[PDB]
Each structure stands twice: as structure tokens, then as C-alpha cells.
């Protein structure tokens, strides 16, 4: 059984490994050069690995290797210029944590894993077009030289700007719905010396909320941090358009993030040399063309990054796609079944990711969460906070969102017209928890 995968990123490399070790003949094409071929060139991007992604790597036999290079994040460290930052633990103990991993290093581990299983990877070749009728595709290098290949099954794991998706959209209406996101983002750096000087906790995810914009920082093994600024592209107030150069960015940080600016030694340089990224939510009505082509990961469901679940979801997709392809009656049945299974969950995490921005960038909120804590301690089997369901369990995203709604409305009604917990009867709410939330 033969398969061609476009995109040696995260979902594409994992699915290549899962299929190759199950006896598939896998050819993987990547536009970029092989990152394992060391050059004289300078990437420090990292991201949050959670249970969904970790479990996928576990099935693939790669979790231990990945986690050996990951920094444990036990909770959120929220920074507001006046208050001292105190850790908000993510869960009960160190089993409920998030892992900060270098993106390039994760990709290199996955690349070795795909080749170890027997997949052939071809770099410096980007997909340009697909001829579905003749079952041929065209690739080219950066210099334009074109190369045609026959294909039997085409997997689009080629990112938020998928060329496979573009080619599919010409032979079928994919029912695309693009919801633009006003925030851009910029990557900045904190050195190991600066993070130590300012006593920045290494085993935590750091947030500098500020309403319509915010900063986060994730730790690295060498105690450096990668900082991400999230800020509106244009003003409808601060925006990227008002930050014309690095000196403008410095003044912006000194006023709005005074506690963080002194840690950003290379702010001016990083701001001018690192391009501003774009965010969006893109929903598709269908992800496949017959039994010929299918999308997964960011190619299928671009999402805003405010829940740190895009990679985790993409690796989850890879496991599911490989499972369906392995045991289906035929490729067409597999792709339809894969799409039917994962589409509702992708929509759920896309919606939860958008909702989560409000939860971070920022009364009744505190009393509700207090009661939620008591309910969790009374019925840890039934009342599980949505964040923990998304982050530390493998419950289908849509199921996690549905239970999260039941719980939010539960706490909202119980707290309504109550000044404090002393006036709330905790037994009747537990009764409602047992009534509406199975274990
Ligand atoms: C700022 C930011 C922060 C994020 N933080 C997190 C986080 O903390 N946790 C998390 O889980 N997710 C996070 N995400 C999301 C995560 O990065 C993506 O969801 C994930 O990388 C998607 O994996 P993928 O394999 O589908 O796509 P990618 O990882 O983008 O892989 C696509 C691959 O295809 C290649 N390619 C592209 N076009 C072509 C072509 N025409 N031909 C051949 N190859 C091609 C690319 O070079 C690349 O190697 C974040 C995203 C952003 C933007
Ligand atoms: C880029 C990114 C990555 C993440 C998270 C967030 C906000 C962002 Cl912006 N989150 C969600 C979260 N919510 N509250 N604390 N963490 C995580 O858990 C780690 O992955
Ligand atoms: Cl994300």
C-alpha cells in the first residue's frame, strides 16, 4: 500500500512513521531543507506539549526521547506590575503538567523516527499542483525546476497554507469559512542571564496579560525563554502598525510591560528581524477527495493558538488517520471515516481556543471557580474543569466542550444572587452535578 505525504512537519512525520511501520510504502516531500543537516546558520521557537500530543508520541515510541529535552511547566505565572507573581498550579501534582519543547528538536526527532520506520523523505521539494484525474502531482525547488510524480494516496500535512488543500479546492467545493483574527504575533527572547537575574521561574508558563494584547513566555533547557507578543495588526489603540521600528517597540514595552522590558535585551533587533506572524480560524466542510486525498493538522483546521493545542490536535489527527487507513475496507472508506470522526472535535477545539483568549488576557469569576474547586474535590470523577479535560485527558474535544458548558452553566446559576459561598448550599449543586454529569 502506497502513500505520498506532503509536509514533513509534525503531523506529516508522525503519520509517516505510523504507516511505514505498518508496512506502507511512504514517500514524504518537504519544501524546506532537512533541518538535521547542520549549517552555519543560526530557530528558538518552542511550544507546549500536552497529554494528547504526548500520548500520540507514546504510541509511536518517541515520547521518552522528546520529553528528555522538555522543560516541565507546573502552572501559570501571571505577571501584573504591582502584584507578586504566584504560581497557579495546573493540577493536583506533577502528573498534570505541560512540557515546553523546542519545535526544531521535536521535528528532528520525528524525522529520525519516520526514517527508522522505513519512510523515504525528500526535502527541498514543494508541492505546486495536483492532477487528480491523471493521478499525478508537480513539485518544484526554490529555483523553479519542476518534477512530476505519480501518486495513489495523497496526505496533506502541509500546514495552514496547505498546497494540497488548494489543489483539492479546485476539484471539489471544500466549503471554506475563514474567520480572520485581528492579532498578529512577534517572537522575542530572554537570555539565560536575564531570566536568572530577574528570578524568572523556569518550570512554569508565564503570562503578561493586558486586555486586547498580551505576552507569554515558555522556558528552554538552558534557562532562556521564548517570548511571544500578541497584538492587533491595526488599530480600530496599540497595534503593530504603530510600532514602526524597534525603538517604537521599546517605548511600547517600557510603558505597557515595564516589568518585562528590562528582560528583553535584544528587543529592538528581534522586533525588526523577526517577521510578524498571522493568525486565523479556517473551517472546512470536507477534508478529503474520494480515496485520493485527505488533509490533517493545520492543513485541515487552522486555529488560533490561545489554547496551545494545534500541535497536540495535529498529532492526535495523525494517530486517527493511520488507524483508519490501516483497518478500513478501502482508502475511500478510511478517509470518510477519519473526516467524520475528527471534524466535530476540530470544530470544538477551534471554538475553545478562541474562547480561551478572554480567559488569559484579563469577582463573580472567583466565586464560581471556588465552587468549581469544591465540586471537583467532592466529585473528581464527574466535575473536571474544562482546561483539565482539554489538556490532561484524551476525551474527544467536542465531549470536553459539552461537559464544560454544563459545568459553566452549573456554577453560573449556583453563584447567581449569592454574595459568598456561606450562602450557597453545596449539597444541592453536587446533586445537580450527579444529575447532569456522568463519571
Ligand atoms: C504563535 C504560535 C504558537 C503556538 N503554540 C502552540 C503550543 O504551545 N502548543 C501546540 O500544541 N500548538 C501550538 N501552536 C500550533 C502548532 O504550531 C501547529 O498547530 C502545528 O505545528 C501544526 O502541525 P502540522 O504538521 O499540521 O503543520 P506544520 O507543523 O506547520 O508542518 C507543515 C509542514 O509542511 C511544509 N510545507 C508547507 N507547504 C508545503 C508545500 N507546498 N510542499 C511541501 N511541504 C510544504 C512546511 O515546511 C512544514 O514542514 C502554535 C502556533 C502558533 C502560530
Ligand atoms: C501559545 C500558547 C500555548 C499554550 C497556552 C496558551 C494560552 C498560549 Cl497563548 N496554554 C493555555 C493556558 N491557559 N492558561 N494557562 N495556559 C497552555 O496550557 C500551554 O500551551
Ligand atoms: Cl495552538
Amino acid at each position: 500500500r502506497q502513500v505520498t505525504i506532503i509536509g514533513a512537519g509534525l503531523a506529516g512525520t508522525l503519520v509517516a512513521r505510523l504507516l511505514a511501520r505498518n508496512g506502507w510504502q511512504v514517500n514524504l516531500f518537504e519544501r524546506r531543507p532537512d533541518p538535521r543537516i547542520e549549517t552555519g546558520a543560526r530557530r528558538s521557537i518552542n511550544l507546549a506539549l500536552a497529554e494528547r500530543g504526548a500520548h500520540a508520541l507514546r504510541l509511536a515510541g518517541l515520547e521518552r526521547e522528546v520529553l528528555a529535552e522538555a522543560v516541565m511547566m507546573r502552572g501559570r505565572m501571571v505577571h501584573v506590575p504591582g502584584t507578586p507573581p504566584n504560581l497557579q498550579p495546573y493540577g493536583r501534582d506533577d502528573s498534570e503538567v505541560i512540557w515546553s519543547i523546542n519545535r526544531d528538536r521535536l521535528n528532528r526527532i520525528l524525522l529520525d523516527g519516520a526514517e527508522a520506520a522505513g519512510a523515504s523523505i525528500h526535502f527541498n521539494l514543494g508541492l505546486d499542483s495536483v492532477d487528480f484525474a491523471r493521478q499525478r502531482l508537480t513539485l518544484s525547488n526554490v529555483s523553479g525546476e519542476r518534477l512530476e510524480k505519480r501518486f495513489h494516496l495523497l496526505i496533506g500535512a502541509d500546514g495552514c497554507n496547505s498546497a494540497v488543500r488548494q489543489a483539492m479546492a479546485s476539484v471539489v467545493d471544500l466549503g471554506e469559512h475563514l474567520e480572520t483574527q485581528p492579532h498578529g504575533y512577534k517572537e522575542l527572547q530572554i537570555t539565560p542571564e536575564a531570566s536568572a537575574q530577574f528570578n524568572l521561574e523556569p518550570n512554569a508558563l508565564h503570562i503578561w496579560p493586558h486586555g486586547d494584547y498580551m505576552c507569554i513566555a515558555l522556558p528552554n533547557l538552558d534557562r532562556s525563554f521564548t517570548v511571544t507578543l500578541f497584538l492587533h495588526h491595526q488599530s480600530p489603540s496599540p497595534s503593530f502598525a504603530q510600532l514602526v521600528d524597534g525603538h517604537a517597540a521599546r517605548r511600547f514595552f517600557q510603558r505597557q510591560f515595564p516589568d518585562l522590558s528590562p528582560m528583553l535585551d535584544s528587543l529592538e533587533q528581534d522586533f525588526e528581524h523577526h517577521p510578524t506572524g498571522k493568525l486565523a480560524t479556517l473551517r472546512l466542510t470536507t477534508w478529503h477527495v474520494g480515496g485520493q486525498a485527505v488533509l490533517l493538522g493545520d492543513a485541515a483546521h487552522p486555529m488560533v493558538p490561545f489554547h496551545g493545542q494545534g500541535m497536540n490536535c495535529a498529532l492526535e489527527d495523525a494517530v486517527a488517520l493511520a488507524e483508519h487507513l490501516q483497518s478500513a475496507a478501502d482508502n475511500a472508506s478510511a478517509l470518510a471515516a477519519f473526516t467524520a470522526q475528527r471534524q466535530p472535535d476540530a470544530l470544538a477545539i477551534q471554538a475553545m481556543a478562541l474562547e480561551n483568549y478572554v480567559e488569559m488576557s484579563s469577582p463573580t469569576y472567583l466565586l464560581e471557580r471556588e465552587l468549581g474547586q469544591i465540586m471537583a474535590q467532592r466529585q473528581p470523577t464527574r466535575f473536571i474543569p474544562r482546561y483539565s479535560m482539554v489538556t490532561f485527558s484524551r476525551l474527544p474535544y467536542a465531549q470536553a466542550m459539552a461537559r464544560g458548558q454544563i459545568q459553566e452553566q452549573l456554577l453560573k446559576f449556583a453563584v447567581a444572587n449569592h454574595s459568598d459561598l456561606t450562602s450557597i448550599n453545596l449539597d444541592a449543586v453536587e446533586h445537580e452535578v450527579t444529575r447532569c454529569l456522568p463519571p
Side-chain angles (χ1 to χ4, degrees):
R1 300 200 280 188
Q2 309 176 235
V3 62
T4 299
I5 306 168
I6 308 303
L10 308 174
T13 56
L14 182 61
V15 83
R17 173 168 173 86
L18 298 172
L19 292 167
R21 74 178 185 179
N22 271 332
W24 290 68
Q25 179 191 135
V26 181
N27 283 110
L28 175 60
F29 290 93
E30 168 58 45
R31 173 199 275 158
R32 290 156 37 205
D34 189 342
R36 297 166 299 174
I37 302 178
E38 299 251 352
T39 67
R42 54 207 146 188
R43 298 182 177 180
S44 187
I45 299 183
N46 53 27
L47 70 184
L49 175 69
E51 173 53 23
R52 294 172 191 277
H55 171 87
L57 299 168
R58 197 174 305 142
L59 293 172
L62 303 174
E63 187 190 23
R64 195 188 228 74
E65 195 177 358
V66 172
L67 287 183
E69 336 205 6
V71 179
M72 178 188 289
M73 293 188 289
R74 281 192 187 92
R76 318 167 201 83
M77 195 66 72
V78 179
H79 293 259
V80 166
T83 304
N86 295 298
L87 185 74
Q88 300 165 15
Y90 278 137
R92 58 188 87 150
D93 57 20
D94 279 9
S95 69
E96 304 199 291
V97 299
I98 308 305
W99 302 99
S100 178
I101 177 69
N102 178 273
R103 178 187 295 268
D104 176 70
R105 183 42 178 161
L106 171 62
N107 181 235
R108 291 195 279 106
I109 285 164
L110 286 165
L111 289 168
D112 293 329
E115 287 179 343
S120 299
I121 312 180
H122 308 279
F123 297 88
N124 307 289
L125 283 171
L127 180 70
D128 289 326
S129 60
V130 181
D131 188 328
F132 286 92
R134 317 218 301 100
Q135 312 180 28
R136 301 182 66 79
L137 50 81
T138 300
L139 309 134
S140 65
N141 60 11
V142 63
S143 81
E145 279 180 307
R146 294 182 182 180
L147 164 59
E148 288 189 11
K149 298 281 183 180
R150 193 208 203 290
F151 74 94
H152 298 266
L153 175 60
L154 187 65
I155 294 173
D158 49 337
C160 58
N161 296 130
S162 171
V164 175
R165 181 178 74 231
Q166 208 176 68
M168 287 168 56
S170 61
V171 295
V172 296
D173 191 288
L174 298 171
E176 310 188 28
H177 172 51
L178 172 63
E179 176 175 347
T180 187
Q181 185 66 23
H183 291 91
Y185 68 87
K186 185 85 76 175
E187 273 126 25
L188 309 168
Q189 272 293 131
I190 298 172
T191 64
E193 293 70 32
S195 81
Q197 175 173 122
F198 292 86
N199 300 306
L200 206 61
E201 171 56 41
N203 287 123
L205 191 150
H206 298 253
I207 312 173
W208 289 259
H210 208 299
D212 283 359
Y213 49 97
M214 62 167 191
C215 287
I216 61 157
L218 279 67
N220 295 314
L221 292 165
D222 64 354
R223 212 198 206 286
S224 70
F225 288 74
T226 304
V227 177
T228 304
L229 165 68
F230 290 102
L231 173 70
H232 283 176
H233 284 295
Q234 310 288 346
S235 309
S237 54
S239 72
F240 274 108
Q242 278 148 212
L243 307 178
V244 310
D245 54 57
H247 295 289
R250 175 64 76 182
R251 291 184 287 268
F252 167 77
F253 268 89
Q254 279 171 346
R255 181 174 221 93
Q256 309 296 358
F257 297 105
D259 53 316
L260 172 63
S261 181
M263 283 183 289
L264 302 170
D265 289 305
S266 57
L267 175 53
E268 291 86 353
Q269 312 93 277
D270 298 338
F271 199 88
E272 293 186 355
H273 303 337
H274 299 167
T276 304
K278 319 186 78 70
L279 308 172
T281 306
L282 177 65
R283 306 173 172 87
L284 280 45
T285 63
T286 193
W287 294 0
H288 69 104
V289 177
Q292 284 190 282
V294 65
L295 306 167
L296 78 161
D298 280 5
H301 46 68
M303 73 190 68
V304 299
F306 305 120
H307 217 305
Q309 282 291 309
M311 173 270 292
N312 291 278
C313 182
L315 302 186
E316 200 174 62
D317 291 347
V319 170
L321 181 53
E323 275 173 4
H324 282 285
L325 280 167
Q326 181 63 11
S327 68
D330 46 58
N331 289 345
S333 300
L335 302 192
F338 167 76
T339 298
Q341 179 197 328
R342 298 294 297 162
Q343 261 181 351
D345 299 314
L347 284 175
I349 185 57
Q350 282 177 315
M352 288 187 288
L354 284 160
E355 294 177 9
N356 204 43
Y357 179 84
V358 185
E359 243 258 28
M360 299 142 41
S361 58
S362 298
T364 320
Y365 208 87
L366 314 183
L367 203 66
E368 288 187 22
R369 196 252 258 285
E370 258 195 303
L371 181 59
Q373 229 122 40
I374 291 169
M375 289 300 106
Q377 299 164 0
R378 292 204 183 190
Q379 295 274 242
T381 174
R382 298 169 181 271
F383 198 97
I384 304 119
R386 195 184 82 176
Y387 179 88
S388 303
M389 289 193 292
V390 172
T391 307
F392 305 120
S393 81
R394 302 184 285 106
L395 187 70
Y397 283 131
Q399 211 171 333
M401 176 161 70
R403 290 182 69 99
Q405 296 166 16
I406 293 169
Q407 293 175 171
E408 159 53 9
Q409 312 219 64
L410 243 168
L411 299 170
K412 188 178 62 147
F413 185 92
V415 165
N417 280 246
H418 286 287
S419 310
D420 39 52
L421 283 140
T422 57
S423 55
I424 298 172
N425 161 258
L426 312 174
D427 290 9
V429 53
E430 182 174 3
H431 162 277
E432 191 73 9
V433 170
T434 63
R435 182 204 131 197
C436 290
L437 293 153

